[PDB]
Design a binder for this molecule. Structure first.
Ligand code: ATP
Ligand code: MG
Ligand code: MG
Lengths: 985, 75, 147
């Protein structure tokens, strides 16, 4: 009973079984500071059975440095009591409670236990009980720019899925008697040594089709070995191999034993000596806190740093750690001991929430065991960081001033950012900016733009929106929510509802872009990303790109004059199945789904568009006759949908649906089998229907079958919607009507002047004149996946399953059909939190104005295997132009609105280059091969006038510049790249 | 020396080659005998696919070795 | 983008086609209209076929859309002009040029591939009665590829 209308995006990552098992697990959370509340929010959105909180400490002002559910009116009230009320409204299926006191036996009521902001002795006491009773125990800690995560799921943890990937499957070319299995041509299985696979539909070796998993020995990118198959057979032809994933047993250790002999997880191999240092540092920190009544070292205090270093030395000697302590790093940890950042809190909260989901669902490979992370490169260097500057001022920003100081806080308060999109990533970015106090100064400002509206499925990962807000614009709701969270942002945020594109340049013009400080992207398509990247390159503004895909995520930073732009990078393309495979010879369910989508478009969308356009354009027929590829098809569609097959009731719609069923699932198959019989052979003698090609078989219409009836109902409903009729779903009428249907005879045909125009004219004149039909319009069917009351996905599933039954392929349910056809991108809340944390950690680097390229880090991570990696950005390529160093991306030519001839002369005299091609937008303004008459007509005109003449459209008043792409050859004719031209109107 | 090339249907073709011969020459001989374009010939020996630009000796092919020939399928 | 486009448009003139003429349609580089001359040693000898090439906005990161305009009677080309190829569909590496496409279509015209056809009936005719296929191809290329 999983509400797939709410967890639609998450189920594509986890699955039905994972959520079914997850809806029976209890989670306890000790500590309700920023990290604790973030973890609680993520878990509540995840959908666990219930969440319990325990943090009885009174609220203080500085706690608001990273808490977004606390207001200044909550001083003196326990954090849990004031947080449960706001947490209970995130999800209606997840009750949230509060417990005043914690008892050891009470811990047996929970399935997972998360511990934050607790002393080491209490952690040991809890772990000593939660280890021997088989309870997952996750301890998290965030100190300034450092973070520690510890996981313990018992000594007999069972991990069903270790990577989260789909099982690998493939086709076989030939199998030798020595177990040599060969893939098809240029086909890579991707298996690894030690994997288990099973073979089916193997011809010549039936024994391998039993299903017993077998070991895998990788012998090459295209072949592997299984051993000896002497007994089973001699040689095998064709077949399919499928990988089998077996559960694994992972054994952890208790905290007390792992303190002596830990097991680190290295998040980066460039700094491998740090985790051993941090392991001692955090224990020494806990000891110092215990030695000062729970008082952490004061910010940037030398004496506290010395005392902490002495404690570190004592602990290192005690534990027989043969490691020399790094004084500088340890003292830096001491200085930031009281730090509390919202970016690190969000990052660690997302990570720990993912770990909790792993623990509850027994899926994916978890951390084993310690995970120490630091982003010490984010420490500002352009401001004075000292004890005086980092002391608290009794304000809500103490947790951040204690790390960065007041001057950098003032620098942040005057930012002028621009956030594109208000999705999940947009919501997290806005939350982080609100917590940090971004643009809370006099000169600060925030702009958020997004044209989409909130839907029900967006509530799973967008915590700023409530069910009462379904159907409204995202920007307004987000702005209101962040004004409620931080009252200081009242009037400092402007929310637009404009799509960021070529048509919105009248609003996001020069005035708008000349006051910004940085642009942050929260988009989900590549085209808009490229558009924003081009705009940022033109205006030379820092850009922050972030992308997610399931549990994987990546973040990239683009800095002017330092690093290359996003466009230089490229994502993998999309594999479009060859038209031959889709049209005639499918062999997978994806082919059938694609065929069904194309059929839907051709049956319910294109003909209606043609009919509507015929009755609107007074000269449609003449234009189509000499422009459209298949005028005959358009004429036939218009005739059929206007006069020949215009329904007058729902019964005629049912009859038409039956006829289309017969046409597409019973007749074309007969034609194909008549052209290529099942016993036909290729030119080389091989059987035709072998390997990737599967012999089809015609279907006979049986009303009692569920799939046939579903297809009939869906087709009839869609036809009625197209013709604006009243549809029905009672099976009685369908069974009554379809009984009296006489199938027209059909026999496959073997085949064996300029009158075609005459036939087309005869068809055309048969159509009623447009004047006769005034106000008669047919409703086209626009595909909408999220709506479950339009029979779209139902029809697609029916068609795909029927075509699969034609070719003996495994049918798929409505869930996978919706996943594939709708191009739904899997998404998770934890990945969003992590990417937001990384982007906000890069943002403080950008604010500080760091110049070196090694201080920035593009980040990539995969939460399925706990993989994190950070690499330096790729430097922008340089080039030699006219014996000078030219940046390929961030350099341009600034010229007035001179004539084209003057521009050519300038490039000939200044750069010593001969211009050969000059373009702007999608037009070729000037080329070296154009007829001399055209050039002589175009040369004495200005660039603006030339563009106006060529594009046949006047330049808008808001336009103030032109971007020209120029390709020129040198004196010897050798082509040399040059930067674009920025003509100033 | 002499070698045997097995096809997808179990046929065995005997070829006279030398350990120093290039893969290109062998593909040329197979095209001369069976008419299969070299671009579509995928020769495998001991679980390793022979690549253009090398010699038989590079793959440790010796007296009376056995190869397998599969054919690429055009789109 | 237009960089690539133009570089190839230019080298085309420096690469005497001999059997092609890819010309941009007016002043929209994103919609060329090339041409192909029927091979001498083919039933389609003495024919001129016009093709429309629409470059996607992500070119060369996405394959170009090449569609025949002149009707041709070929096993692997349907009436709509869609072309059955992998360099255009899934094998579109970002390491290709119009030249290649325009000599791979010529090679396809040189010899069809009926083992993996796109028009089953024409493929059946070609496999069974070669002479009828020859006559039909000649008739079609005379009716459409001429005049
Ligand atoms: N060109 C664009 N201009 C402005 N906003 C854009 C543009 N492209 C995408 N967006 C916004 O980016 C956000 C995409 O985020 P997300 O994918 O999580 O939301 P969604 O598309 O509503 O949801 P789902 O992908 O789950 O169906 C949406 O708010 C969309 O409005
Ligand atoms: Mg949406
Ligand atoms: Mg989306």
């Amino acid at each position: 009973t999983i509400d797939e209308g709410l967890y639609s995006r998450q189920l594509y990552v986890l699955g039905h079984e994972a959520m079914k098992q997850m809806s029976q697990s209890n989670v306890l959370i000790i500590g309700c500071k920023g990290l604790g509340v973030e973890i609680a929010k993520n878990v509540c959105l995840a959908g666990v059975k219930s969440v319990t909180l325990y943090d009885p400490q009174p609220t203080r002002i500085e706690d608001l440095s990273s808490q977004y559910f606390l207001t200044e009116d909550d001083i003196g009230v326990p954090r849990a009591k004031v947080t449960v009320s706001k947490l209970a409204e995130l999800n209606q299926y997840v009750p949230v409670s509060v417990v005043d006191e914690l008892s050891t036996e009470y811990l047996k009521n929970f399935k997972c236990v998360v511990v934050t902001e607790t002393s080491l002795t209490k952690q040991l006491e809890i772990n000593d009980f939660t280890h021997k009773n088989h309870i997952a125990y996750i301890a998290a800690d965030s100190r300034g720019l450092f973070g520690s995560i510890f996981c313990d799921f018992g000594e007999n943890f069972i991990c069903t899925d270790t990577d989260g990937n789909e099982p690998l499957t493939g086709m076989i070319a030939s199998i030798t008697d020595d177990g040599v299995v060969t893939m098809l041509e240029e086909t890579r299985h991707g298996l690894e040594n030690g994997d288990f696979v099973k073979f089916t539909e193997v011809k010549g070796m039936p024994g391998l089709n039993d299903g017993t998993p077998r070991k895998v020995e990788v012998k090459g990118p295209y072949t592997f070995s299984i051993g000896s198959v002497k007994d089973l057979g001699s040689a095998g032809y064709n077949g399919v191999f499928t990988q089998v994933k077996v559960p694994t047993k992972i054994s952890f250790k208790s905290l007390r034993e792992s303190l002596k002999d830990p097991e680190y997880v290295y998040p980066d191999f460039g700094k491998m000596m740090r985790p051993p240092q941090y392991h001692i540092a955090f224990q020494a920190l806990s000891a110092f806190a215990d030695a000062h009544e729970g008082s952490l070292p004061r910010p940037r205090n030398d004496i506290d740093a010395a005392e902490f270093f002495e404690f570190c030395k004592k602990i290192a000697s005690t534990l027989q750690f043969d490691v020399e302590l790094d004084e500088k790093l340890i003292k830096e940890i001491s200085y930031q001991a009281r730090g509390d950042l919202v970016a690190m809190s969000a990052f660690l909260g997302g990570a720990v929430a993912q770990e909790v989901l792993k623990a509850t669902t027994s899926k994916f490979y978890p951390l084993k065991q310690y995970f120490y992370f630091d982003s010490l490169e984010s420490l500002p260097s352009s401001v004075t960081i000292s004890e005086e500057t980092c002391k608290p001022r009794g304000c809500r920003y103490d947790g951040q001033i204690a790390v960065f100081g007041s001057e950098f806080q003032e620098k942040i308060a005057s930012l002028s950012t621009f956030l594109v999109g208000a999705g999940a990533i947009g919501c997290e970015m806005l939350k982080n900016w609100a917590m940090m106090g971004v643009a809370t100064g006099e000169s600060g400002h925030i702009s958020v733009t997004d044209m989409d509206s909130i839907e029900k499925s967006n509530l799973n990962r967008q915590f700023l929106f409530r069910p009462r807000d379904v159907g409204k614009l995202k920007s307004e709701c987000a702005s209101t929510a962040v004004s409620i969270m931080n009252p200081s942002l009242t009037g400092k945020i402007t929310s637009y509802q404009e799509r960021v594109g070529p048509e919105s340049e009248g609003i996001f013009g020069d005035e708008f872009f000349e006051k910004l400080s940085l642009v942050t992207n929260a988009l989900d398509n590549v085209e808009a990303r490229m558009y924003v990247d081009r705009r940022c390159v033109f205006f030379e503004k820092p850009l922050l790109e972030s992308g997610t895909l399931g549990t994987k995520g990546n973040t990239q930073v683009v800095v002017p004059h330092l690093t290359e732009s996003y466009g230089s990078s490229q994502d993998p393309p999309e594999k479009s199945f060859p038209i031959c495979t889709l049209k005639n010879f499918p062999n997978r369910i994806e082919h059938t789904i694609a065929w069904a989508r194309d059929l839907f478009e051709g049956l319910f969308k294109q003909p209606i568009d043609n009919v509507n356009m015929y009755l609107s354009s007074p000269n449609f027929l003449e234009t189509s006759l000499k422009t459209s590829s298949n005028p005959r098809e358009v004429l036939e569609n218009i005739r059929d949908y206007l006069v020949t097959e215009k329904p007058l009731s729902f019964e005629e719609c049912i009859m038409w649906a039956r006829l289309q069923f017969d046409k597409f699932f019973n007749n074309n198959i007969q034609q194909l089998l008549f052209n290529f019989p099942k016993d036909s052979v290729t030119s080389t003698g091989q059987p035709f229907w072998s390997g990737p090609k599967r012999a089809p078989t015609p279907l006979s219409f049986d009303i009692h079958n569920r799939e046939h009836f579903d297809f009939i109902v869906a087709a009839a409903s869609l036809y009625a919607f197209n013709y604006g009729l009243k549809s029905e779903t009672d099976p009685a009428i369908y069974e009554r009507v379809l009984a009296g249907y006489n199938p027209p005879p059909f026999a496959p045909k073997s085949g064996i002047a300029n009158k075609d125009k005459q036939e087309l004219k005869s068809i055309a004149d048969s159509l009623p004149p447009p004047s006769s039909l005034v106000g008669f319009r047919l409703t086209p069917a626009e595909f909408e996946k999220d709506d479950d009351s339009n029979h779209h996905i139902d029809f697609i599933t029916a068609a795909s399953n029927l075509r699969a039954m034609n070719y003996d392929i495994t049918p798929a349910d409505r869930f996978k059909t919706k996943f594939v056809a709708g191009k739904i991108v899997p998404a998770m809340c934890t990945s969003t939190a992590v990417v937001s944390g990384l982007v906000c950690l890069e943002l403080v680097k950008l604010v500080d104005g760091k110049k070196k390229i090694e201080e920035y880090k593009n980040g990539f991570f995969n939460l399925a295997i706990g993989l994190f990696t950070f690499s330096d950005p790729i430097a922008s390529p340089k080039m030699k132009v006219n014996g000078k160093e030219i940046d390929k991306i961030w350099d341009r030519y600034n010229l007035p609105d001179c004539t084209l001839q003057e521009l050519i002369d300038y490039f000939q005299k200044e750069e010593g280059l001969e211009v050969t091609m000059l373009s702007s937008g999608v037009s070729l303004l000037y080329a070296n091969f154009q007829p001399p008459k055209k050039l002589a007509e175009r040369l004495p005109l200005k660039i603006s006038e030339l563009v106006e003449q060529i594009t046949k459209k006047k330049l808008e008043p808001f336009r103030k510049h032109l971007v020209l792409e120029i390709c020129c050859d040198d004196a010897n004719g050798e082509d040399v790249e040059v930067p674009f031209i920025c003509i100033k109107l | 020396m002499q070698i045997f090339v097995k096809t997808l249907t179990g046929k065995t073709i005997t070829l006279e080659v030398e350990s120093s011969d290039t893969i290109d020459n062998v593909k040329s001989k197979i095209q001369d005998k069976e008419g299969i374009p070299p671009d579509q010939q995928r020769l495998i020996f001991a679980g390793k696919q022979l690549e253009d630009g090398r010699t038989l000796s590079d793959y440790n092919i010796q007296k009376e070795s056995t190869l397998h020939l599969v054919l690429r399928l055009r789109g | 983008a237009l960089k690539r486009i133009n570089r190839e448009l230019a080298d085309l003139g420096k690469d005497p086609p001999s059997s092609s003429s890819a010309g941009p349609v007016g002043d929209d580089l994103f919609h060329w209209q090339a041409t192909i001359m029927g091979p001498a040693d083919s039933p389609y000898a003495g024919g001129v076929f016009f093709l429309s090439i629409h470059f996607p906005t992500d070119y060369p990161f996405k394959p170009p859309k090449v569609n025949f305009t002149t009707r041709i009677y070929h096993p692997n080309i349907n009436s709509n002009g869609s072309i059955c190829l992998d360099i255009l569909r899934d094998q579109w590496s970002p390491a290709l040029t119009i030249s290649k496409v325009l000599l791979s279509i010529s090679s396809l015209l040189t010899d069809p591939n009926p083992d993996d056809p796109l028009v089953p009936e024409i493929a059946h005719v070609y496999k069974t009665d070669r002479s009828r296929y020859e006559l039909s191809a000649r008739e079609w290329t005379r009716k459409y590829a001429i005049g």
